[PDB]
Scaffold this active site. Structure first.
Site, PDB file in Angstrom:
ATOM      1  N   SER A  42       0.802  -1.206   0.000  1.00  0.00           N
ATOM      2  CA  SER A  42       0.000   0.000   0.000  1.00  0.00           C
ATOM      3  C   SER A  42       0.850   1.278   0.000  1.00  0.00           C
ATOM      4  CB  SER A  42      -0.906   0.106   1.235  1.00  0.00           C
ATOM      5  OG  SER A  42      -2.031  -0.789   1.262  1.00  0.00           O
ATOM      6  N   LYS A  45       0.533   3.654  -2.940  1.00  0.00           N
ATOM      7  CA  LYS A  45      -0.588   4.575  -3.075  1.00  0.00           C
ATOM      8  C   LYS A  45      -0.126   6.021  -3.071  1.00  0.00           C
ATOM      9  CE  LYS A  45      -3.804   1.156  -1.226  1.00  0.00           C
ATOM     10  NZ  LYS A  45      -4.934   0.924  -0.299  1.00  0.00           N
ATOM     11  N   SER A 102      -6.391   3.604   3.373  1.00  0.00           N
ATOM     12  CA  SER A 102      -5.827   2.585   2.537  1.00  0.00           C
ATOM     13  C   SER A 102      -6.886   1.782   1.784  1.00  0.00           C
ATOM     14  CB  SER A 102      -4.930   1.673   3.351  1.00  0.00           C
ATOM     15  OG  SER A 102      -3.905   1.269   2.494  1.00  0.00           O
ATOM     16  N   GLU A 138      -4.725  -3.396  -7.560  1.00  0.00           N
ATOM     17  CA  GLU A 138      -5.188  -4.064  -6.344  1.00  0.00           C
ATOM     18  C   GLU A 138      -6.187  -5.151  -6.733  1.00  0.00           C
ATOM     19  OE1 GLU A 138      -4.044  -3.612  -3.462  1.00  0.00           O
ATOM     20  OE2 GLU A 138      -3.276  -1.518  -3.392  1.00  0.00           O
ATOM     21  N   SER A 209       1.196  -3.542   3.869  1.00  0.00           N
ATOM     22  CA  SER A 209       1.492  -4.927   4.236  1.00  0.00           C
ATOM     23  C   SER A 209       1.012  -5.837   3.107  1.00  0.00           C
ATOM     24  CB  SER A 209       0.852  -5.316   5.563  1.00  0.00           C
ATOM     25  OG  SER A 209      -0.544  -5.326   5.445  1.00  0.00           O
TER      26      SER A 209
HETATM   27  C1  LIG Z   1      -1.789  -1.984   1.797  1.00  0.00           C
HETATM   28  O1  LIG Z   1      -0.666  -2.476   1.901  1.00  0.00           O
HETATM   29  N1  LIG Z   1      -2.925  -2.727   2.020  1.00  0.00           N
HETATM   30  C2  LIG Z   1      -4.239  -2.137   2.061  1.00  0.00           C
HETATM   31  C3  LIG Z   1      -4.985  -2.407   3.408  1.00  0.00           C
HETATM   32  N2  LIG Z   1      -4.448  -1.499   4.456  1.00  0.00           N
HETATM   33  O2  LIG Z   1      -3.256  -1.915   4.974  1.00  0.00           O
HETATM   34  S1  LIG Z   1      -2.275  -0.505   5.270  1.00  0.00           S
HETATM   35  O3  LIG Z   1      -1.132  -1.157   5.874  1.00  0.00           O
HETATM   36  O4  LIG Z   1      -2.068   0.019   4.010  1.00  0.00           O
HETATM   37  O5  LIG Z   1      -3.022   0.221   6.258  1.00  0.00           O
HETATM   38  C4  LIG Z   1      -4.838  -3.902   3.781  1.00  0.00           C
HETATM   39  C5  LIG Z   1      -3.452  -4.493   3.630  1.00  0.00           C
HETATM   40  C6  LIG Z   1      -2.798  -4.175   2.284  1.00  0.00           C
HETATM   41  C7  LIG Z   1      -3.439  -4.926   1.145  1.00  0.00           C
HETATM   42  O6  LIG Z   1      -3.874  -4.382   0.127  1.00  0.00           O
HETATM   43  N3  LIG Z   1      -3.454  -6.277   1.325  1.00  0.00           N
HETATM   44  C8  LIG Z   1      -4.065  -7.165   0.356  1.00  0.00           C
HETATM   45  C9  LIG Z   1      -5.547  -7.294   0.766  1.00  0.00           C
HETATM   46  C10 LIG Z   1      -6.229  -8.296  -0.148  1.00  0.00           C
HETATM   47  N4  LIG Z   1      -5.550  -9.592  -0.131  1.00  0.00           N
HETATM   48  C11 LIG Z   1      -4.166  -9.437  -0.561  1.00  0.00           C
HETATM   49  C12 LIG Z   1      -3.389  -8.481   0.386  1.00  0.00           C
END
Ligand SMILES: *C(=O)N1C[C@H](NOS(=O)(=O)O)CC[C@H]1C(=O)NC1CCNCC1
Length: 259
Positions: A42, A45, A102, A138, A209
């Site tokens: 993330s 972004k 996010s 994503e 993450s």
């Molecule tokens: C970003 O890395 N993301 C988006 C969301 N927030 O996490 S943060 O650390 O950015 O606050 C969840 C984790 C991560 C993400 O997109 N993870 C995916 C989610 C869907 N499954 C594959 C991993």
């Protein structure tokens, strides 16, 4: 010394740690695996939002442009977009959602607007960042498979670019301020770099993450009465199902700062 402390932290963590600190007081750097590639997750972004901000410099209506949200846009992590199904969000609203909650739908709409991952990458190249690559949308951009260069950058490149975007001249005056405003308003981040800094310091950051226990944070930091710092802490692990380790990022931040 700082290098030994970072190597020891990395050993304790069991994973692979990448750090780049830029101290704008003297243009000095602290670097650890800073030319190795890490999956951004993330933290990418920030670059997508910055690419839209750049476009808005020559298109003043852009941040107000309405983007439809539909069920088909939903992925899994969409706390803001899921409230606007069958309605619209402006590009400003999508940028804020991507950077402060996010939201992954919001990220996908930023990517699509500018032309896709290769267009975000081309924006990075125009800034002089020849390392960043955004390959996927994503949710697949977060797989973080060891050895896979997709959706990666290096700590050095991301620190230098974040400095350019938030403190330098990559963006126009209003747009730079907007990016800083958005990053200072993030609803997460307190457990990552911020947890390794004094309470009084002001931070704008974006975490991420993903697979392989990948745990990341990129930040602009205003220590009390001092010139700002830029800090990138990227971390990833050997096991596909490893758990996040925000504490490692906090510990790295504490090591590389005098706080
Ligand atoms: C970003 O890395 N993301 C988006 C969301 N927030 O996490 S943060 O650390 O950015 O606050 C969840 C984790 C991560 C993400 O997109 N993870 C995916 C989610 C869907 N499954 C594959 C991993």
């Amino acid at each position: 010394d700082v290098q030994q402390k970072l190597a020891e932290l990395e050993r304790q963590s069991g994973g692979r740690l990448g750090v780049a600190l830029i101290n704008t007081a003297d243009n000095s750097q602290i670097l650890y695996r800073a030319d190795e590639r890490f999956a951004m997750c993330s933290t990418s972004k920030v670059m997508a939002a910055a690419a839209v901000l750049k476009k808005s410099e020559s298109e003043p209506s852009l941040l107000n442009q309405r983007v439809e949200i539909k069920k088909s846009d939903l992925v899994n992590y969409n706390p803001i977009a899921e409230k606007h199904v069958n309605g619209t969000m402006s590009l400003a609203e999508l940028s804020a959602a991507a950077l402060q909650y996010s939201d992954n739908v919001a990220m996908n709409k930023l990517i699509a607007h500018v032309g896709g991952p290769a267009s975000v990458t081309a924006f990075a190249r125009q800034l002089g960042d020849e390392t960043f690559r955004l390959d996927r949308t994503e949710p697949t951009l977060n797989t973080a498979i060891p050895g896979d260069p997709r959706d990666t950058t290096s700590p050095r490149a991301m620190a230098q670019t974040l400095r350019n975007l938030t403190l330098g001249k990559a963006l126009g005056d209003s747009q730079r301020a907007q990016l800083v405003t958005w990053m200072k308003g993030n609803t997460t981040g307190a457990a990552s770099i911020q947890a390794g800094l004094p309470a009084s310091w002001v931070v704008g950051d974006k975490t991420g993450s993903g697979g392989y226990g990948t745990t990341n944070d990129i930040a602009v930091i205003w220590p009390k009465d001092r010139a700002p710092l830029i800090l990138v802490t990227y971390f990833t692990q050997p096991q596909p199902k490893a758990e996040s380790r925000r504490d490692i990022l906090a510990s790295a931040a504490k090591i590389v700062t005098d706080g």
